[PDB]
Amino acid sequence: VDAEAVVQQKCISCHGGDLTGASAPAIDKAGANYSEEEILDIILNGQGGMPGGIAKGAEAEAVAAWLAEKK
Ligand code: HEC
Q: What is the CATH number of the domain that holds 52?
A: 1.10.760.10
Residue from 13, 47, 69 to probe ligand 1 pocket by mutation (most atoms less than 8 Å from CB):
47
Experimental technique, in short, is: NMR
The Cα–Cα gap between 17 and 66 comes to: 16
Q: Output the CA–CA distances (angstroms, integers) from residue 16 to 37, 42, 57, 58, in the order listed.
A: 23, 17, 23, 22
Backbone φ, ψ for residue 50 (5° rounding):
-70, 120
Q: CA triplet 28, 30, 34: central angle to 5 degrees?
A: 170
Neighbouring CB atoms inside 10 A of 60's CB total 23
Q: What is the 3-state secondary structure (H, E, C) of the chain?
A: CCHHHHHCCCCHHHHCCCCCCCCCCCCCCHHHHCCHHHHHHHHHHCECCECCCCCCCHHHHHHHHHHHHCC
Comparing CA positions, the residue from 48, 53, 55 lying closest to residue 9 is 55
Domain that holds residue 2: 1-71
Q: Partners of 50 in the beta sheet?
A: 47
| Alpha carbon distance, N-terminus to C-terminus of the chain | 19
Q: How many domains does the chain have?
A: 1
